Amino acid sequence: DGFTVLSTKSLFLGQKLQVVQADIASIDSDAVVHPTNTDFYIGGEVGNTLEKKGGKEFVEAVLELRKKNGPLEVAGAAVSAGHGLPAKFVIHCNSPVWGADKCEELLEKTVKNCLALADDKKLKSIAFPSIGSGRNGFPKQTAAQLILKAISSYFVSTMSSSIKTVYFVLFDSESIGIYVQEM
Numbered sequence: 001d002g003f004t005v006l007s008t009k010s011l012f013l014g015q016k017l018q019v020v021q022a023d024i025a026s027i028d029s030d031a032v033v034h035p036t037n038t039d040f041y042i043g044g045e046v047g048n049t050l051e052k053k054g055g056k057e058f059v060e061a062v063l064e065l066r067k068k069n070g071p072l073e074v075a076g077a078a079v080s081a082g083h084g085l086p087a088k089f090v091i092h093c094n095s096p097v098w099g100a101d102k103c104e105e106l107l108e109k110t111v112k113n114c115l116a117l118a119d120d121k122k123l124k125s126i127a128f129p130s131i132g133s134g135r136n137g138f139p140k141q142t143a144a145q146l147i148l149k150a151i152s153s154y155f156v157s158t159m160s161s162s163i164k165t166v167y168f169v170l171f172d173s174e175s176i177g178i179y180v181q182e183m
């Protein structure tokens with residue numbers, strides 16, 4: 001595949017939130033978001049697609065980041081170069097596990113931290129997948145509404161802010177099916 005725009009929303013200053021159907025690895029935004037864990041394990045669904053696309057270049061960048069950063073703190077966001085990928089940078093986030101205490105709040109928090117990091121690097125665009133709803137077990141709709149809520153909230157409260165466009169990237173048929181059905 002593949003690229004379809006499914007929904008577009010105006011954020012607080014008219015910045016655009018686009019929900020799109022695509023493989024996130026194929027998106028050429030300034031940043032793409034990789035949901036990972038404290039050890040930067042590259043074995044979630046999105047991690048596997050980034051590794052498929054970027055190969056060794058991608059993996060060694062993640063390793064170098066783990067060595068420089070140390071373990072990724074709860075809800076933490078960190079950035080590596082997008083070697084092997086269309087995206088300029090990869091923002092790595094410590095994705096909460098469904099069922100862990102305060103897991104919804106932490107999902108919101110991690111999203112905002114990814115946005116702050118992109119802003120700190122003066123990035124114009126950032127692509128999020130449905131963080132938490134793969135290997136970490138969130139229900140797809142719950143994950144998606146938390147992420148979209150957290151992006152909107154960021155832009156209401158952030159004065160500015162270099163981000164022009166936010167992509168919310170859906171790939172699995174269940175997520176797409178529920179997004180479209182329930183909207």
Ligand SMILES: Nc1ncnc2c1ncn2[C@@H]1O[C@H](COP(=O)(O)OP(=O)(O)OC[C@@H]2O[C@H](O)[C@@H](O)[C@@H]2O)[C@@H](O)[C@H]1O
Binds near residue numbers: 036133138170
């Ligand atoms: N090519 C793709 N593009 C965009 N989204 C995709 C793609 N493939 C799958 N997805 C969707 O990405 C969402 C996030 O899933 P994961 O990447 O598995 O992320 P998460 O559930 O947060 O957890 C992965 C994490 O990686 C570590 O190995 C592990 O500690 C943790 O489980 C899911 O809805 C999944 O269907």
